[PDB]
Amino acid sequence: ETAFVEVVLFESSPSGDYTTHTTGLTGRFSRAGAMLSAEGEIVQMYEYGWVGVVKLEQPELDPKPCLTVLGKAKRAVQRGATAVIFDVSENPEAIDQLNQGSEDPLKRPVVYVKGADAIKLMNIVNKQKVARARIQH
Amino acid sequence: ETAFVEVVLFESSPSGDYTTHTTGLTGRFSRAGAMLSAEGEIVQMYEYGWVGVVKLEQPELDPKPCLTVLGKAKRAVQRGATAVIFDVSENPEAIDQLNQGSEDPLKRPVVYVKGADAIKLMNIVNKQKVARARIQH
């Protein structure tokens, strides 16, 4: 169940000597996707190997949306996403909705985050360009 | 100014437990760009945080090409590339033209390889399409 998420900044010194910085957050796996660990370069919402980070907004703003959260999940997997992380803060409904795709469940894991862990995540993304996530269990 | 390049493949297991495979490699940093070290996902020849990896073909095939090497180099950095690795194994003279950019050098490192290090890379990039690069010095 619990999905451990490491976010990893990387940064070089003029020397060549580099330094890497890492941040632990925790969210859950959606039964909508696999129970695998995974990793790639983060992307907020190609070539393969990337991690969608998707902030869900209130559905009041999006009464009937383009794609449902699942659709967005699956859409991501088919653009190469090695995994997908929704921030479900603004809409706790997505959890309930995410977890209705156990029948035809994606082959890449599908994690949501909320509250204090969601806010850590978002702060790192927005402040820095490069960034790779690991997602474990 | 020797570049130590490591290509790194991730491969989860059903358990959550996972495995990393790292293949070291050597190259050269061109004066056309920086003497930093960098990290990012690999792309052979939109995102921020990638390492382009360009094979250069025998320069008869392409007599007057769209872009030069250094024009390629700069296209990738313009499009986010955190570095660029050219494969010059089939076009040795690229080295010469890369290093005439050494009073305009690019923010991101520009690196090349050739011969056996070249193959290793190319071998790994194709056989699996989900690969990560750290580049040193």
Residue numbers in the entry:
A (entry chain A), B (entry chain D): 54 to 98, 113 to 204
Question: What text appears in the publication on this structure?
Answer:
Rspo (R-spondin, also roof plate-specific spondin) proteins are evolutionarily conserved from fish to humans and have well-documented roles in a broad range of developmental and physiological processes resulting from enhancement of canonical and non-canonical Wnt signalling. ZNRF3/RNF43 specifically targets these Wnt receptors for ubiquitination and turnover, hence reducing Wnt signalling responses. Direct extracellular interaction with Rspo proteins inhibits ZNRF3/RNF43 activity. Here we report a molecular level analysis of the ZNRF3/RNF43 ectodomain structure and its interactions with Rspo proteins.
The ZNRF3ecto crystal structures revealed a distinctive variant of the protease-associated domain topology. Two β-sheets (comprising β2, β1, β7, β3 and β4, β5, β6 strands, respectively) splay apart, accommodating an α-helix (αC) at the open edge; two additional α-helices (αA and αB) pack against the β4, β5 and β6 face of this distorted β-sandwich. A disulphide bridge, conserved across species, links two structurally elaborate loops, β3–β4 and β4–αA. The crystal structures for apo xZNRF3ecto, zZNRF3ecto and mZNRF3ecto showed no major differences in the main chain conformation. Comparisons of ZNRF3ecto structures for proteins crystallized in several different crystal lattices, or for crystals containing multiple copies in the asymmetric unit, consistently highlighted an acidic region (N105-E114; residue numbering is for mouse sequences unless otherwise stated) within the β3–β4 loop, the short αC–β7 loop and the extended β1–β2 hairpin as flexible elements of the fold. Our crystallographic data provided independent structures for multiple copies of the ZNRF3 ectodomain in eight different crystal forms. All but two of these crystal structures reveal an extensive interface (average interface area 992±109 Å2) formed between two ZNRF3ecto polypeptide chains. This dimer is conserved, and pairwise structural superpositions yielded r.m.s.d. values of <1.3 Å (for 275 equivalent Cα pairs). The interaction is twofold symmetric; strands β3 and β7 of the ‘subunits’ abut face-to-face at the core of the dimer. The β1–β2 hairpin forms a second interface by reaching out to embrace helix αA and the β3–β4 loop in the opposing subunit.
